[PDB]
Amino acid sequence: SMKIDVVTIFPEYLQPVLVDVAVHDLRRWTHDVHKSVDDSPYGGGPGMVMKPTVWGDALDEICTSETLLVVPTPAGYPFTQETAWQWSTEDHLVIACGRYEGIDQRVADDAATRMRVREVSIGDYVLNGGEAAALVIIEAVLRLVPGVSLLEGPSYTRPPSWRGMDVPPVLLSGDHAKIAAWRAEQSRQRTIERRPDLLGFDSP
Amino acid sequence: GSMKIDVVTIFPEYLQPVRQSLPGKAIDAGLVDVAVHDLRRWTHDVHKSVDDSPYGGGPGMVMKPTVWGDALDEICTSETLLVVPTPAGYPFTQETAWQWSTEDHLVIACGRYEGIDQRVADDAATRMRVREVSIGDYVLNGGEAAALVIIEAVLRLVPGVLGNASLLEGPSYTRPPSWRGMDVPPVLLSGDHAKIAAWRAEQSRQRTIERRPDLL
Numbered sequence: 554s555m556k557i558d559v560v561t562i563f564p565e566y567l568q569p570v571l572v573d574v575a576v577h578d579l580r581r582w583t584h585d586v587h588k589s590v591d592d593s594p595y596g597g598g599p600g601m602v603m604k605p606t607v608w609g610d611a612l613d614e615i616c617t618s619e620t621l622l623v624v625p626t627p628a629g630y631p632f633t634q635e636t637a638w639q640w641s642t643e644d645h646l647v648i649a650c651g652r653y654e655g656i657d658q659r660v661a662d663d664a665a666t667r668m669r670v671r672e673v674s675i676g677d678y679v680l681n682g683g684e685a686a687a688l689v690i691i692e693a694v695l696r697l698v699p700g701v702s703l704l705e706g707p708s709y710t711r712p713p714s715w716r717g718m719d720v721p722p723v724l725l726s727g728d729h730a731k732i733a734a735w736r737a738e739q740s741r742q743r744t745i746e747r748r749p750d751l752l753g754f755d756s757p
Numbered sequence: 758g759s760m761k762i763d764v765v766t767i768f769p770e771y772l773q774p775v776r777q778s779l780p781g782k783a784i785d786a787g788l789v790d791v792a793v794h795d796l797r798r799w800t801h802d803v804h805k806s807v808d809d810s811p812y813g814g815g816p817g818m819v820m821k822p823t824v825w826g827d828a829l830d831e832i833c834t835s836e837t838l839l840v841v842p843t844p845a846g847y848p849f850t851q852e853t854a855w856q857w858s859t860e861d862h863l864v865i866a867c868g869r870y871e872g873i874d875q876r877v878a879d880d881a882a883t884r885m886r887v888r889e890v891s892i893g894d895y896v897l898n899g900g901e902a903a904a905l906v907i908i909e910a911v912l913r914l915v916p917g918v919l920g921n922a923s924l925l926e927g928p929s930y931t932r933p934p935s936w937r938g939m940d941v942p943p944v945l946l947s948g949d950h951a952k953i954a955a956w957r958a959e960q961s962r963q964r965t966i967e968r969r970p971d972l973l
């Protein structure tokens with residue numbers, strides 16, 4: 554049993570999403586006519602920063618002391634399969650999706666005084682906001698919820714010959730030991746080629 | 758400055774946010790076109806089968822090479838960069854995103870189940886460029902969420918497409934100067950712009966040590 558609340562200024566983007574997922578429009582917690590959620594940065598720089606006031610009101614309504622507050626950010630701790638396993642047994646995730654140049658840092662800092670907060674990144678690339686990260690996190694976590702290292706080698710299915718390209722003969726041989734051995738080898742070879750860091754080697 | 762992206766998936770509805778993400782100005786200008794295709798269009802049988810049991814045994818199913826082969830034959834050309842999300846891929850990084858942002862045609866092949874018969878990529882690679890990539894060290898149900906991430910990271914680097922314009926980035930602040938007992942760091946209001954730059958550099962250094970020491 555898990556509840557996920559997602560807060561965003563683009564609730565439309567969350568449509569592709571024992572478990573309930575609710576999406577909230579951040580602008581619901583504004584009071585001005587223009588529904589402003591952003592302001593220019595202190596200290597200079599391009600772009601806009603999301604106001605802490607509006608976020609504070611939203612999270613006040615949605616969160617409890619037992620909530621795990623998830624804040625996607627390119628400067629976050631890495632979100633990995635380990636993280637997904639850890640969050641898979643949580644009762645309540647709230648995912649705060651930023652836009653513009655992100656959310657005023659005091660939102661997470663203040664939240665951390667009364668709940669657990671996790672600033673995380675889903676990978677070493679830049680997005681325009683937290684919504685795609687939210688989709689990734691939700692997918693990776695929900696598939697691990699009860700009741701729902703190395704790289705994987707290549708997989709094959711019928712026909713055994715296609716366009717003059719054959720399924721590796723060992724996979725047709727019914728020899729479980731030889732097949733397991735071949736698959737372990739294919740895995741380790743793919744890992745050293747594509748992800749040498751996983752085996753403790755320098756990256757290209 | 759212009760790019761066509763074709764996405765092939767058994768869940769075309771999943772790619773709805775991307776079409777929503779696209780400003781009319783870039784489309785009208787012919788700067789960008791994202792098309793999504795139902796893989797089942799290329800199935801051969803009345804049951805519209807896209808998957809079959811894996812050779813050598815094991816759990817799950819593998820996507821059929823015959824179906825994918827027909828789809829890619831129709832959609833791809835010699836200029837195509839074929840992108841195949843997979844947890845076993847090379848890492849997709851910002852460097853990758855910058856490279857791909859200058860391409861004219863991306864085709865993203867979204868798998869499901871235990872992925873796509875390897876001969877599809879191997880065959881495709883004999884007449885176009887193929888890139889098997891992973892967006893991170895976690896496991897998804899299929900390639901669609903990865904496609905969303907890749908499309909966003911690439912298209913935001915193409916001038917005027919999405920509307921937007923080393924160490925980790927540091928914290929950002931805006932009004933009010935004091936909020937729930939927390940003050941914006943006074944240096945940011947000091948008007949000492951060299952000092953502010955140095956402060957930001959130190960925040961970035963500390964954050965990187967704490968969160969991503971691998972980058973150091």
Ligand SMILES: N#Cc1c(-c2ccc3cc[nH]c3c2)n[nH]c1N
Binds near residue numbers: 677
């Ligand atoms: N997680 C993650 C992210 C993001 C991201 C997250 C939130 C915001 C808010 C404004 N821009 C954002 C980018 N970019 N790249 C990642 N791996």
Ligand SMILES: N#Cc1c(-c2ccc3cc[nH]c3c2)n[nH]c1N
Binds near residue numbers: 843869898899
């Ligand atoms: N990229 C990427 C992926 C995936 C992914 C991609 C395609 C398929 C097809 C079946 N299962 C998949 C998982 N999982 N985790 C990642 N970083």
